[PDB]
Amino acid sequence: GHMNPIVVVHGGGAGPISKDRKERVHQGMVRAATVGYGILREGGSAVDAVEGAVVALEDDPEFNAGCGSVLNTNGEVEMDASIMDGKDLSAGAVSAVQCIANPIKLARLVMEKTPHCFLTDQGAAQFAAAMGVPEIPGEKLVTERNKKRLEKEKHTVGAVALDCKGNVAYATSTGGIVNKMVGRVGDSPCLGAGGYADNDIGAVSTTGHGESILKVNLARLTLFHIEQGKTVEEAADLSLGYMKSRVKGLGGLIVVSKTGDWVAKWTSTSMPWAAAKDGKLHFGIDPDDTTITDLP
Amino acid sequence: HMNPIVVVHGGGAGPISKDRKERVHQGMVRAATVGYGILREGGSAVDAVEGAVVALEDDPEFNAGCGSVLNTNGEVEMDASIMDGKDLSAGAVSAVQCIANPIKLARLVMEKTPHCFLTDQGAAQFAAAMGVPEIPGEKLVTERNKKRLEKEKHLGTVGAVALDCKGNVAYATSTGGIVNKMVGRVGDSPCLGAGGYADNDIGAVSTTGHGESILKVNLARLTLFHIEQGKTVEEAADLSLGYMKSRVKGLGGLIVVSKTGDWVAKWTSTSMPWAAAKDGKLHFGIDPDDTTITDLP
Ligand code: NA
Ligand code: NA
């Protein structure tokens, strides 16, 4: 039974987003989801699809990952990412990486080129250089906008896919939270928290307050509820409902089951998202604002 | 109020040398006694697990702190995590260098930053801001490990869980990682839900074994999922370890305490040093069903 592929993408939990920013975010989200879907509709893998979708958002300055990442307490971008393949649980992740364009791609290089799942900071820096990953200057990742945020504070992106072959996958990438301590790691590179992908269940990517997501293991908690025979929506409502009640943390996630069902749900104010299935594009930011367009 | 309990584990690894066994034995006892010494004072589960793990870090026999296995550059890089079951408060550090006690650094992360996870450079910088002694790195490197890396060139994670006399639980885990690991490789040990989980509403787990496999199956929280579904602790431990072996071909072990004070130590590797203190007795084993149960003064 060859399945109808689906990709879902998110541009991060957010507070209120302005009318103008919404529109730029919309273009970036459509573009990411369009890249992802293209891979899937040419018979690509779920992993290829999630990596592609998230590179798109890393490169795009309107999203807090890669270029457009928030800056740590010291004005520099430090980035976290992870990828996971649902068929064998193979996984790749990186924490505290700097001076590279695409943390998610290196997260894949960890998964594919090493016996390990997770490299960090100085070690992740060395492995990149060794794999032929270029080093780009700091300001290349630093935007003027994120400088104003940092000074104003002082004084996450993801994807899930189901492919033709029935494989599920997730990728997540982030700059983290603004003015963070040097070396702060969030949920993104910690499988079970930043995401989790399993062919016997499905795949999820999360976003929001990184510490809360970790404490509760939101991704695996959503998939627990699914293994229990709750729908993708019900499952999201419980796990998010739990992070809210138990630890007062808010965020969002995206999930696709092995049966093809999907949903974006969030307890933050907004979470830009887009999905693609059966030549149709589903987009939303605020609850109920969802649109559907022909995606030929 | 609840009868307190501390379980400790050394590394879940292959067969152990005859003379190593004695040193290992005494190590378990030291750590379990520390944790139980803390509990018998009415002290917290967080305190006991920290104390137990601290002892194992300081003991050059165990793969954490002094005596950590060596990476590829012949250097010590350490991970640790600790978690408060009360409200799920947690702290963690990874690839940390030239300090005695990663576990204490993670507790500081939990209680003295608004974060739960620091790595490498930032962690060392936080270590400074907290006055943690930056010790000569060569203090942590041992001859057994120096020699062991030369061979691989051409024990495993330690941990503790505890339920205190208020019924709170905690876990703590610390490691030097794996022999000849790549530079800045980070295992399961500082990863919430993999290396360990603690939740007053279910129990506490600390894990050991193939870190990548443990990370892939989210070993610690998995074990808890089963306890939720009604499993006994050993049934749950059997089920999670069982799945790890069948799904990622990984071998490991775990200690668990449930919210009501049911507890077990189980492993799928050949061996796992483990000790438990409860009801005035101390339990200790290395091999499946070799348990000695003796009196604790
Ligand atoms: Na970006
Ligand atoms: Na030690």
| Rounded CA separation B103/B171 (Å) | 11
Reduce the secondary structure of B198-212 to three states and give it as a string: EECCCEEEEEEECHH
| Rounded CA separation B144/B82 (Å) | 28
User: Hey, how many other C-beta atoms are within 10 angstroms of the C-beta on A2?
Assistant: 8
Q: Which two tokens stand for residue B214?
A: 């443990």
The alpha carbon of residue B225 is apart from the nearest alpha carbon of chain A, in Å, by 8
Long-range contacts from A132-139, C-beta under 8 angstroms, 24+ separation: A133/A100, A133/A105, A133/A106, A133/A109, A134/A100, A134/A101, A135/A99, A135/A100, A136/A99, A136/A100, A136/A101, A137/A99, A138/A76, A138/A77, A138/A98, A138/A99
- Is A119's CB within 8 Å of B225's CB? no
Amino acid at A119: L
Q: Judge contact between A109 and A131, C-beta under 8 A.
A: yes
Amino acid at A274: A
Answer left, alpha or beta for residue A173, where phi above 0 means left and psi between -120 and 50 means alpha: beta
Q: Judge contact between B79 and A170, C-beta under 8 A.
A: no
Residues 6+ apart with CB under 8 A from B162: B4, B5, B6, B7, B35, B39, B45, B48, B49, B52, B169, B170, B204, B257
Of the listed A114, A120, A156, A291, which one is catalytic? Answer: A156
| Rounded CA separation B104/B50 (Å) | 7
Interface of A with B in 162-181 (CB under 8 A): 180-181
| Rounded CA separation B291/B296 (Å) | 15
Amino acid at B287: D
* Technique that determined the structure: X-ray
The closest alpha carbon to A218, from A197, A200, A202, A195, belongs to: A195
- Residues B271, B272, B277, B283, Cα dihedral to 10°: 10
Q: Which two tokens stand for residue A37?
A: 């879907």
Concatenated DSSP letters of A45-109 = -HHHHHHHHHHHHHHSTTSSSSTT----TTS---EEEEEEETTT--EEEEEEE-S-S-HHHHHHH
The number of residues in chain A equals 296
The closest alpha carbon to A175, from A100, A250, A124, belongs to: A100
| Rounded CA separation B112/A63 (Å) | 30
Residue numbers after which chain A is interrupted (C to N above 2.5 A) read: 155
Per DSSP, helices labelled H in chain A are 19-41, 46-59, 103-113, 121-131, 144-154, 210-216, 218-227, 232-247
Q: Which two tokens stand for residue A73?
A: 């307490």
Q: Judge contact between A98 and A78, C-beta under 8 A.
A: yes
Q: Is A186's Cβ below 8 Å from some Cβ in B?
A: yes
Q: Judge contact between B80 and B174, C-beta under 8 A.
A: yes
Residues 6+ apart with CB under 8 A from A162: A3, A5, A6, A46, A168, A202, A203, A256, A258, A260
| Rounded CA separation B160/B172 (Å) | 5
Residues 6+ apart with CB under 8 A from A279: A294, A295, A296
Q: Which two tokens stand for residue A158?
A: 């993801």
Residue A260 host element (H or E): none
Residue appearing with tokens 């189901």:
A162
Residue numbers after which chain B is interrupted (C to N above 2.5 A) read: 154
**Exposure string for A277-291, b = 16+ CB within 10 A, e = fewer:** beeebbbbbeeeeee
The alpha carbon of residue B216 is apart from the nearest alpha carbon of chain A, in Å, by 6
Residue B192 host element (H or E): none
The number of residues in chain B equals 297
PDB resolution in Å: 1.9
Amino acid at A182: V
Q: Judge contact between B12 and B288, C-beta under 8 A.
A: no
| Rounded CA separation A37/A149 (Å) | 33
| Rounded CA separation A43/A166 (Å) | 11
**Annotated binding residue A80:** no
Interface of B with A in 202-261 (CB under 8 A): 211-212, 215-218, 221-222, 225, 247-248
Answer left, alpha or beta for residue A227, where phi above 0 means left and psi between -120 and 50 means alpha: alpha
User: Using the 8-state DSSP alphabet, how is residue A184 labeled?
Assistant: B
